[PDB]
């Protein structure tokens, strides 16, 4: 064993890249499916409560990745990858969970959208500050600032598509829901099977128990910290729970796309497999916590 991935084969890499970019397009269009400008004006009056959730999820996510990296003294590059993992919008799935259980979707979607179009703002600065903290900031000259911004703007293009679509005929979202479900299911299964077959040996390099423990705890920890903070600021139970679970689940697609495009494939290697395990684990744990809550309200 202890062999480097049998790399050099481009067509599989390109298939990975193209499916990832198209899922980025479709998910950010699904963001554009939601109308918010009407709520933007109304919520500008008292956004302080909303802004608290925003700054909380912007702050906790990096520091959590930082502290879990430190506590497991994780090697530098995968700790950096985890840092990328913590910082991502992750709103569609959260919206789905909340709609499944309860809540006013109007808030969840607007926090998601503003998280997106402020991520390009705070993303680079948080990367810059917390890169220095790994040991001395060894990656300082490897962070692709402008390339990250390019990835971000390509992500943001479907946001522009959706927002201008609001100005035009909103009827198009009547068919939008179907297609969205089919494309998300197909892309999920496709990435699973392709990222499995394309590299087999390196998966064992990507399955270290430390990675499993982090990918499990840190989203759960995000849930807990959102819960406790929203309890601290006297917010209602429903808003507290919504913001908690919105924090708990991130954007695997954005992180994966940044990992593949911003850094060399051999640099990321099977560590690219981490966000998939992440995402499936938040799916499982979110369902479990939904069931646990429905048990709690009973008794």
């Amino acid at each position: 064993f202890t062999l480097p991935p049998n790399f050099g084969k481009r067509p599989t890499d390109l298939a990975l890249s193209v499916i990832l970019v198209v899922m980025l397009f479709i998910i950010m269009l699904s963001l554009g499916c939601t109308m918010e400008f009407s709520k933007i004006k109304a919520h500008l009056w008292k956004p302080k409560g909303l802004a608290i959730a925003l700054v909380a999820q912007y702050g906790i996510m990096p520091l959590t990745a930082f502290v879990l990296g430190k506590v497991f003294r994780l090697n530098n590059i995968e700790a950096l990858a985890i840092l990328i993992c913590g910082c991502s919008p992750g709103g569609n799935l959260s919206n789905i969970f909340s709609l499944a259980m309860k809540g006013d979707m109007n808030l969840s979607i607007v926090m998601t959208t503003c998280s997106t179009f402020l991520a390009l703002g705070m993303m680079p600065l948080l990367l810059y500050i917390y890169s220095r903290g790994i040991y001395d900031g060894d990656l300082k000259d490897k962070v692709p600032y402008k390339g990250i911004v390019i990835s971000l703007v390509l992500v943001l293009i479907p946001c522009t598509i959706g927002i201008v679509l609001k100005s035009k005929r909103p009827q198009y979202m009547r068919y939008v829901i179907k297609g969205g479900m089919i494309i998300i299911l197909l892309c999920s299964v496709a990435v699973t099977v392709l990222s499995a077959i394309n590299v087999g040996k390196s998966i064992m390099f990507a399955m270290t128990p430390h990675l499993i423990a982090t990918s499990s705890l840190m989203p759960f920890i995000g849930f807990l910290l959102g819960y406790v903070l929203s309890a601290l600021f006297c917010l209602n139970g429903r808003c507290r729970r919504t913001v908690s679970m919105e924090t708990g689940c991130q954007n695997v697609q954005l992180c994966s796309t940044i990992l593949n495009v911003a850094f060399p494939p051999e640099v990321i290697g099977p560590l690219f497999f981490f966000p998939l395990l992440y995402m499936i684990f938040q799916l499982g744990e979110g369902l479990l916590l939904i069931a646990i809550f429905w048990c709690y309200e009973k008794f």
Epitope: N75, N76, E78, Y135, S202, V267
Partner: nanobody, 124 residues
């Protein structure tokens, strides 16, 4: 910000355990790999061997199994590639390179590495 430098002058046919030593000067931090390379005329650089400076795990490319090695000199800030006596074939310019990247596997790709010494030219 690490400066590299090499020392090798073995130009002989098979039967020479050629002393190769790559003195390293710089921030010898943790978790940085360091490797050795090739330049035969007209073909690009390609990986041969490497080792994490911190843990000490080494790897060997296919051509060098049983034929090369690498040794850490961490107290004196040196790396020690003793290539075993090799056929007249392997005549090539060799290099040194190291990345601060720390990972379980061995990074192999040409373009990844950053710090380059004045790699020695040796024939066999």
């Amino acid at each position: 910000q690490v400066q590299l430098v090499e020392s090798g002058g073995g130009l002989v046919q098979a039967g020479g355990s050629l002393r190769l030593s790559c003195a390293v000067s710089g921030r010898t931090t943790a978790n940085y790999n360091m490797g050795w390379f090739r330049q035969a005329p007209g073909k690009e650089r390609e990986f041969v061997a490497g080792i994490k400076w911190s843990s000490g795990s080494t790897y060997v490319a296919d051509s060098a199994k049983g034929r090369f090695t690498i040794s850490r000199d961490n107290a004196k800030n040196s790396v020690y590639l003793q290539m075993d006596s090799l056929k007249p074939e392997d005549t090539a310019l060799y290099y040194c390179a190291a990345n601060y990247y720390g990972v379980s596997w061995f990074l192999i790709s040409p373009s990844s590495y950053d710090y380059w010494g004045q790699g020695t030219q040796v024939t066999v």
